[PDB]
Design a protein around this ligand. Sequence first.
Ligand SMILES: O=C(O)C(F)(F)OC(F)(F)C(F)(F)OC(F)(F)C(F)(F)OC(F)(F)C(F)(F)C(F)(F)C(F)(F)F
Length: 141
Amino acid sequence: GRENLYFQGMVEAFCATWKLTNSQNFDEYMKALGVGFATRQVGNVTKPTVIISQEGDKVVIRTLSTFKNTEISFQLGEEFDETTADDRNCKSVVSLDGDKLVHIQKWDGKETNFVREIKDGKMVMTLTFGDVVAVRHYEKA
Ligand SMILES: O=C(O)C(F)(F)OC(F)(F)C(F)(F)OC(F)(F)C(F)(F)OC(F)(F)C(F)(F)C(F)(F)C(F)(F)F
């Protein structure tokens, strides 16, 4: 009933081609993660395209850039293995929390999370590691 209407309407809102339009404190966020000088210099100029789609029962997230191209495929709320763009081998869970799509990565006893939300048609991504928070805005292409 309302459960399937919530899950279908939420996933539908996020499924699009998203272009990065704005970044805030992403450099600090990469520094808190332990991303070195070399990669950070690339990461601060790289303009990603994020494609979110439904491929069967799975939700797919493709991050396309001149640095590295990543692709993750998952069932909502079911843990999966993920090798990140900065070569961290995580145990990750992508889930729904109200109007938010929450991505939690765990590796080496550490934890980082990315919260994606739709705000006035834009996708706002909040990246958190400890006290360090970054905000990235995306628009539909
Ligand atoms: O979603 C996006 O648009 C995202 F590409 F920027 O990825 C991300 F969501 F920000 C991340 F959280 F995945 O980033 C990261 F965690 F992988 C990272 F911070 F390590 O990123 C990184 F360092 F690898 C990087 F070099 F900056 C990078 F070039 F891959 C990029 F694309 F993220 F900027």
